[PDB]
């Protein structure tokens, strides 16, 4: 059969759209007898626990398998020996000996060797991990990570205490991977596969080698790169039969610059499209604006898969607007608070429950405290069950200045929730119908946005009516079957 391989850098629990899309794609693919596997390229010792929380939170299917070079090559290295080395362990144990344990807390302890005349070791024992920071002339140079009673990773630092090297040990206690880190360019360098005595100059080469080994060169195998920064690695593979599809998950134009400048990562994908089997966009709007200045004759408008959650009893009894997304400048949080003050000026009972985590938490909280919006606009944090949160909403807002498909708004519409969104490029201009499912407002038009929110917070009847149309809107447009037939077409 046809086996697919989704490409991304990392897969954590507190993520956004791309992640949910890939995992929903995988589930629907696996329901159509098409294998859907995710290929990550990061070191996470707790990857099993993360993926287990993801499948338990109904974010990932059980039949989805995640691939990682830090696991693949670790397993190969575990086949090259038979017993645990315990040599590195014995080294640290003997260095902690002839030294005096000076414990600050019940977790943090120091070690003073009278032969070394100084503190040459620090320890932080937690419930699951034990850290050993080594010191020389009061300067940290090494960090020994112990996870599940086994040395898993070691870090070498410099005089400025910047990472310059990273080492990865296996389950038999043997180093299989060594990495050099440029502390000035904050980048990865010489990657050393000790298990195969190989040498790479970049993580790109190492990950390309991983994909060349994990994925055989067969025509019934296909690589779907959804991450724009993982494209280079997939392009430099020695595959001549494996199909390669790239997916643009966001506006291909510079976030702010309206000069028509394109993002390096996205430009790279859209420029090297003659060397891949095709590029998949979500909106026809993106396809058109990309066809211009690229002349790519391999563009596809296959949209993202959205789980069509079952219907429920929405009474719309709570006056609460919601924005479940990353706290990132992508979403115009400033403009949101500038509209929430207008809403509260009329109805001071309307509450803006914002969900998600990010970097602009402090910024939004400052604007919330600057205004009297402390009891109105409240950040609650990342939600593993957004479905429940949206079920207990009235409307969903969007103040984004750039976006892709817009999963959070589509899910809201599918949960019979009216959506008022800023008309944005390559985004909600394809599913938000002004008057039918919600109100499409001009970008940076606080007045109109607030007036539409007000109408819905005072007419619960119209809210339910608009929401009903929103669910049917998604079902008609983004039918899982329809999207799968478009994917199967590109596959065969
Ligand atoms: O040594 P090498 O191997 O060369 O490694 C290079 C290194 O930079 C790699 O870590 C990097 O290439 C990562 O590769 P990926 O692109 O495959 O990883 C994607 C991953 O990482 C994020 O983007 C990355 C890409 O810029 C950021 O360097 C992360 O710091 C970021 O964390 C995440 O996209 C996914 O792991 C999680 O996806 P999500 O579901 O949480 O987020 C939804 C996604 O659609 C959303 O993040 C995008 O809409 C972001 O929009 P952008 O406009 O592309 O990002 C804003 C800015 O970062 C850039 O525009 C700006 O830096 C450049 O103009
Ligand atoms: O606390 C959060 C915040 C976001 N999301 C998910 O993140 C996605 C948001 O995707 P969208 O396309 O709106 O924005 P992106 O993250 O792609 O920029 C939706 O599927 C949400 O379910 C979530 O589950 N919990
Ligand atoms: Cl042996």
Residue numbers in the entry: 1 to 492
What does the paper say about this structure?
Staphylococcus epidermidis expresses glycerol phosphate wall teichoic acid (WTA), but some health care–associated methicillin-resistant S. epidermidis (HA-MRSE) clones produce a second, ribitol phosphate (RboP) WTA, resembling that of the aggressive pathogen Staphylococcus aureus. We report here that the TarM enzyme of HA-MRSE [TarM(Se)] glycosylates RboP-WTA with glucose, instead of N-acetylglucosamine (GlcNAc) by TarM(Sa) in S. aureus. TarM(Se) is a retaining WTA glycosyltransferase; therefore, the relative positions of donor and acceptor substrates in TarM(Se) and TarP are different.
Extensive structural characterization of TarM(Se)G117R with donor and acceptor substrates, in particular, with product uridine diphosphate (UDP) and glycosylated poly(RboP) explains the binding mode of poly(RboP) and the catalytic mechanism of a retaining WTA glycosyltransferase. In the initial refinement, we noticed a disc-shaped, strong positive difference electron density that connected to C4 hydroxyl of RboP2 in all four copies of the TarM(Se)G117R ternary complex in the asymmetric unit. As a result of these interactions, 4RboP-glucose rests in an extended electropositive groove on the TarM(Se) surface. The observed geometry and distances nicely support an internal nucleophilic substitution (SNi)-like mechanism. The ternary complex structure of TarM(Se)G117R bound to UDP and 4RboP-glucose provides, for the first time, clear evidence that a glycosyltransferase glycosylates WTA in a processive manner.
